[PDB]
Target: 3C-like proteinase
Amino acid sequence: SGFRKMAFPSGKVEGCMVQVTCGTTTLNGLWLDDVVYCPRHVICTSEDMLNPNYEDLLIRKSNHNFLVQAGNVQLRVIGHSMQNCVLKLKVDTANPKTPKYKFVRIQPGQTFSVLACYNGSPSGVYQCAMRPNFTIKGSFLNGSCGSVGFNIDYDCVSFCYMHHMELPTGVHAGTDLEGNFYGPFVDRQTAQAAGTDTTITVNVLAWLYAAVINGDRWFLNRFTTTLNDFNLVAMKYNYEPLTQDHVDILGPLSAQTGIAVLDMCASLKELLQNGMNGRTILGSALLEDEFTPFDVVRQCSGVTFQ
Amino acid sequence: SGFRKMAFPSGKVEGCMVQVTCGTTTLNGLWLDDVVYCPRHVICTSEDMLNPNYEDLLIRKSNHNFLVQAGNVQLRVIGHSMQNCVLKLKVDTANPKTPKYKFVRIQPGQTFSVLACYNGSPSGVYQCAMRPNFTIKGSFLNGSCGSVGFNIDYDCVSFCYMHHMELPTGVHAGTDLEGNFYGPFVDRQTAQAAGTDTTITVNVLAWLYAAVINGDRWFLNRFTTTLNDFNLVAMKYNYEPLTQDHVDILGPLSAQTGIAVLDMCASLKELLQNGMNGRTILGSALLEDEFTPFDVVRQCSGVTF
Ligand SMILES: O=c1cc(-c2ccccc2)oc2cc(O)c(O)c(O)c12
Ligand SMILES: O=c1cc(-c2ccccc2)oc2cc(O)c(O)c(O)c12
Model:
């Protein structure tokens, strides 16, 4: 019983966090095998934040301009290369603590854990969601760039996020591990703003199922709804439109609780209309949307508190 | 910028979790030096659960009844022992990944990270606070017993909790690592109910400072309050009494933000007897009380381990 915003155990990522310095700029790097990945704006100086030509900045660098530090050991760079907005430093030494891993790109609504790091050393870990506007609501101070987001499935670390910048509204944008940004963002200090954010509908429904699994159903009602009539209502509360694919993904959870997806959609419609009237759901007075259907099945029991 | 429920990195504890099997029952153990710590109720059977005699139950078993598994390697038990409600299994191997550590007993209102485990394998990590009624609101299924809660200070893990049981309302009860129970519960299948809980006042104010530090200031006001006057208000809403020492502990947060403590107390007062008036604070519709003052200073200055 209980339900928590639960990150993955971060030990396998802790062993890969290094420190990258170029001139007077220091950030975090990801050491896997004999390569260190870090954001390419590590090569920018104070007069390079607005309109940097990274190709022109990189060609002015030798291998010995990049100081890489793994704890106390100094890894010697023997090669460097740029791929989109991530820099790849070939080092002397394969990281002995390298886990099994893969680089993946995720879609909005999907979740991942963040190991917030500073100077190559970890500060904390927490759960995150790629918002529909391709930002994340993380906890990032200056120097955290290079901190990675990840999921762990059967001792394989699927790396999905690398932090690059802080937006003027306080949310955060970054790339996948091949250097391609999430959203229309770029590694320039010029004025950027994210699109209008939106609530992750399929996640709210999965969360409602998790509340039923844990033994609460005061919010259900006797109604059902059509998918289109639900989407017409939900979008007036700034919810993402719910697709048939999402409906199919809530299949397992609909089968565990015996509540049909469009029946849970009907309950959500009433919750948006009424609020909670001084009640809570899984210890929250808002509608949580940063648990995916796979997250809920992972953390929740296989038997409902019926 | 941004503020999140941030757990400690779990890698140091990850290398200490093993599987403990006694006959039918399988739970988790903590492998440190050459000892394995785990709840003593791993010794009970379905029959014993109602009025067990742990001393007699334990006398009747030897070292080979205890199956300890560290991943793929099996650790031999060379001795078994009981210290309060935890079982100590002496093993043939000192854990090589044993970190610098100590056993610490915490206070209600204090926070820690929980490494939820199943069959000796870590599955997740999250922040807890110990409730003033000595329960914690964790996320545990069956098989999670033996999972530990910990804090970190510059390379030193401080173990403060071991999970033992779920109470009927779904909250959880456990012990420190010396086997002493937090709160008035026993490792017996019987009728046990958590006391009436209350809200950790000093933690709510620390979280309001965190909201100010993050440039979210709409709840402040121009009033004052004495300590007493605020305490008379807080007790109606079932808030823990805020002592002088709590006001002292909020000093550094007061200094950084420019908001005097009792001015923030005045701001919490109006927030209680009137509500949020539709707005939120740090993306939350509730007044969060699971951040200590130290948590707020650690997250907003980025202390590392
Ligand atoms: O938002 C950031 C933007 C840039 C940046 C640097 C050069 C050119 C363009 C953008 O560098 C950063 C470095 C950090 O360590 C950090 O925490 C950050 O949030 C940023
Ligand atoms: O609540 C629990 C109670 C008991 C227990 C122990 C001895 C006598 C009677 C009951 O064992 C457990 C074992 C677990 O693995 C677990 O997750 C649990 O929640 C419990």
